[PDB]
Amino acid sequence: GPLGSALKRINKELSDLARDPPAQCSAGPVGDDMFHWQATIMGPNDSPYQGGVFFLTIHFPTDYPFKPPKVAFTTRIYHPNINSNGSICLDILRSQWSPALTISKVLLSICSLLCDPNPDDPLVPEIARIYKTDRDKYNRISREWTQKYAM
Amino acid sequence: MQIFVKTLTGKTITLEVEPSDTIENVKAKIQDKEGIPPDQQRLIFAGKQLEDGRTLSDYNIQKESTLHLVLRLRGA
């Protein structure tokens, strides 16, 4: 069924992550449910999040890969495209999703989001304002939150 | 005339306005103090979403009134 189709796609991507592991990223099933994953992202070197470890939840819908996976942060982070609930604003997770894309590509796209936010279409307007107009303050506060919650 | 604008973070904004000022004008004033563009602004008062094109007197907003500033999301 639809559930059955998603299951084998999930397993395929899981084996591909084993053969070709992502750099500074890892992901896998929480328990024995293949539709519910847990992921980690190291703070990118070219970002004020460097040194921190950020955990994410990944839930695969039953219509995967025809519908995008649902990804959210569990670790708190100071970002204009990520709110206090861990919700993420990213095109690849919605309007620009494609079945040809993978979880590996999603995690890489999130990594880039941490290095270069999209302030013009933000999730947290106040943080976006600081990013655009006072980059030093943005970097300063980002590092502080990294120290407090990502260590 | 002096009104107040409360944010989700708890910050209270103090604005100097006139009864004939449109909601768009008010959003411009908020941009002057907070730097947040009008299209990312969403104003709530008397249980209603204040629409751009109407004045403060249209909603009968008077002195010492407190507006609620919330998020206006555009695809994310």
From Swiss-Prot, chain A:
Keywords: Apoptosis, ATP-binding, Cell membrane, Disulfide bond, DNA damage, DNA repair, Endosome, Membrane, Nucleotide-binding, Phosphoprotein, Transferase, Ubl conjugation pathway. Disulfide bonds join C25-C111. Changing D121H: Strongly impairs lysine reactivity but retains some ability to transfer ubiquitin to BRCA1. Its EC number is 2.3.2.23, 2.3.2.24. It catalyses: S-ubiquitinyl-[E1 ubiquitin-activating enzyme]-L-cysteine + [E2 ubiquitin-conjugating enzyme]-L-cysteine = [E1 ubiquitin-activating enzyme]-L-cysteine + S-ubiquitinyl-[E2 ubiquitin-conjugating enzyme]-L-cysteine; S-ubiquitinyl-[E1 ubiquitin-activating enzyme]-L-cysteine + [acceptor protein]-L-lysine = [E1 ubiquitin-activating enzyme]-L-cysteine + N(6)-monoubiquitinyl-[acceptor protein]-L-lysine. The keyword Disulfide bond applies. It is a peripheral membrane protein. Pathway: Protein modification; protein ubiquitination. Residues 6-151 form the UBC core domain. One of its GO terms (cellular component) is nucleus. The active site is at C89. Changing C89A: Loss of function. Interacts with SCF (SKP1-CUL1-F-box protein) E3 ubiquitin ligase complex; when Cullin is neddylated, the interaction between the E2 and the SCF complex is strengthened. Interacts with DAPK3. Interacts with BRCA1; the DNA damage checkpoint promotes the association with BRCA1 after ionizing radiation. Interacts non-covalently with ubiquitin. Interacts with E3 ubiquitin-protein ligase CBLC. Interacts with UBTD1. Interacts with RIGI and RNF135; involved in RIGI ubiquitination and activation. Belongs to the ubiquitin-conjugating enzyme family. This is Ubiquitin-conjugating enzyme E2 D3. It comes from Homo sapiens (Human).
Curated annotation (Swiss-Prot), chain B:
The record marks R54, R72 as: Interacts with activating enzyme. It comes from the Eukaryota. The record marks H68 as: Essential for function. It is a peripheral membrane protein. Changing R74K: No effect on ADP-ribosylation. It is found in: Cytoplasm; Nucleus; Mitochondrion outer membrane. The modification Phosphoserine is found at S65. Residues 1-76 form the Ubiquitin-like domain. Changing R72G: No effect on ADP-ribosylation. Phosphorylated at Ser-65 by PINK1 during mitophagy. Phosphorylated ubiquitin specifically binds and activates parkin (PRKN), triggering mitophagy. Phosphorylation does not affect E1-mediated E2 charging of ubiquitin but affects discharging of E2 enzymes to form polyubiquitin chains. It also affects deubiquitination by deubiquitinase enzymes such as USP30. Mono-ADP-ribosylated at the C-terminus by PARP9, a component of the PPAR9-DTX3L complex. ADP-ribosylation requires processing by E1 and E2 enzymes and prevents ubiquitin conjugation to substrates such as histones. Changing K63R: Abolishes HLTF-mediated polyubiquitination of PCNA. Changing S65A: Prevents phosphorylation in case of mitophagy. Decreased localization of PRKN to mitochondria. The modification (Microbial infection) ADP-ribosylthreonine is found at T66. There is a cross-link at K6, K11, K27, K29, K33, K48, K63 (Glycyl lysine isopeptide (Lys-Gly) (interchain with G-Cter in ubiquitin)). The modification ADP-ribosylglycine is found at A76. There is a cross-link at A76 (Glycyl lysine isopeptide (Gly-Lys) (interchain with K-? in acceptor proteins)). Changing S65D: Phosphomimetic mutant that binds and activates PRKN. Exists either covalently attached to another protein, or free (unanchored). When covalently bound, it is conjugated to target proteins via an isopeptide bond either as a monomer (monoubiquitin), a polymer linked via different Lys residues of the ubiquitin (polyubiquitin chains) or a linear polymer linked via the initiator Met of the ubiquitin (linear polyubiquitin chains). This is Ubiquitin. It comes from Homo sapiens (Human). The chain holds residues 1 to 76 of 229 of the full protein.
